[PDB]
Amino acid sequence: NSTAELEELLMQRSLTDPQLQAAAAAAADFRILPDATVIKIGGQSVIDRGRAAVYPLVDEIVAARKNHKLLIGTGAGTRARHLYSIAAGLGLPAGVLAQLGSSVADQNAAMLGQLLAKHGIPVVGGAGLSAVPLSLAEVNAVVFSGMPPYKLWMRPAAEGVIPPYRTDAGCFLLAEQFGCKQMIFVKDEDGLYTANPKTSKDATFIPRISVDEMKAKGLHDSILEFPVLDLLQSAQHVREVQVVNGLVPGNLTRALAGEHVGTIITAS
């Protein structure tokens, strides 16, 4: 490989050419925001529960940003499920549902940002490149809306019209793109179990598992949107994620301190 070699392939071949694809893979790898942690705050699992779930998390974020740079993405929740139900019953395609679900993640970002404003933490568009707030000890965190930008260009799932890339995927891809050091999903269960702990009597807790092992055990579609497990296996930067229970006081703080609360899911 060389720069000049790559530049010739880039000029002379289709981008689909395996020889150009392999030369580009040899490029250097820059991490844009390597010292940041991306956290997703679940819509259904946390924000829809109101003050009893959100106020302790707000206190944890305020304490945590003293030691940890944070990008805090919001989930969507029950209002997006309602929009999806109305739109799917009309026969609208996945790209139209995708646009409707963004509005609900935005509402949640606005509500969380208003609780955080007097602590100096803004809601932003462009979290990964919100250079100023992330460089200041007074701030050191931003809130963003967790849906991806795909809108009408959303790829549909193999079946049905629910957008397959929603706020788990939005937050994950932002962590991956900006080369962040850690990705934490804040949900309302202690972590991954062998069955849905809400629906199932003797599900066993799983502290640590690989994407291949999850698929083999029939957990591809359990505590995270299932396409995230495939994005994780393709990821250059974030090769594991941690799922934690935001309802347990201090859980987010402990995960940020390196404690193994919850479940660690690894690409390999």
Ligand X SMILES: Nc1ncnc2c1ncn2[C@@H]1O[C@H](COP(=O)(O)OP(=O)(O)OP(=O)(O)O)[C@@H](O)[C@H]1O
**Which residues ranging from 124 to 153 are in contact with Mg ion (CB under 5 A)?**
145, 147
Q: Which span sits near its own copies by CB under 8 A: 131-139, 144-152, 159-167, 200-208?
A: 131-139
Q: Residue 77, interface with ligand X (CB under 6 A)? A: yes
Kindly report the CA angle at 58 between 54 and 59, in degrees rounded to 5?
Answer: 120
Provide the 10 A C-beta neighbour count for residue 221. Answer: 12
Q: Map the footprint of its own copies across residues 139-158, applying CB under 8 A.
A: 139
Q: Which is nearer to other proteins, 91 or 258 (CB)?
A: 91
Nearest position to ligand X, beta carbon = 75
**Neighbour-count burial of 137, counting CB atoms closer than 10 A to its CB (0-12 exposed, 13-18 middle, 19+ buried):** exposed
51 forms part of the interface with ligand X (CB under 6 A): no
| CB-CB contact of 115 with 58 (8 Å) | yes
Residue from 131, 132, 136, 152 that binds other proteins (CB under 8 A)? 152
* Among 151, 144, 147, residue whose Cα is nearest residue 121: 144
Cβ atoms of residues 162 and 155 within 8 Å: no
Q: Is 3 in the site for other proteins (CB under 8 A)?
A: yes
Give the alpha-carbon dihedral of 85, 199, 157, 18, to 10 degrees: 150
| CB hemisphere CA count around 48 (13 angstroms) | 15
145 binds, options Mg ion, ligand X, its own copies, none, Cβ within 5 to 8 A by partner type: Mg ion
Count Cβ atoms within 10 A of the Cβ of residue 158 and give its class: 0-12 exposed, 13-18 middle, 19 or more buried.
Answer: exposed
- Find the binder of ligand X among 88, 92, 195, 267 (CB under 6 A): 195
Site string for ligand X, 203-232 (x = CB under 6 A): ----------------x--xx---------
Q: Does 167 bind Mg ion (CB under 5 A)?
A: no
Roughly how many angstroms between the first and final C-alpha of the chain, as a whole number?
Answer: 27
Q: Does 32 contact its own copies by CB under 8 A?
A: yes
List residues binding its own copies (CB under 8 A): 3, 28, 30, 32-35, 50-51, 113-123, 128-136, 138-139
List residues binding Mg ion (CB under 5 A): 145, 147
List residues binding ligand X (CB under 6 A): 14-15, 42-45, 75-77, 166-167, 187-189, 192-193, 195-198, 219, 222-223
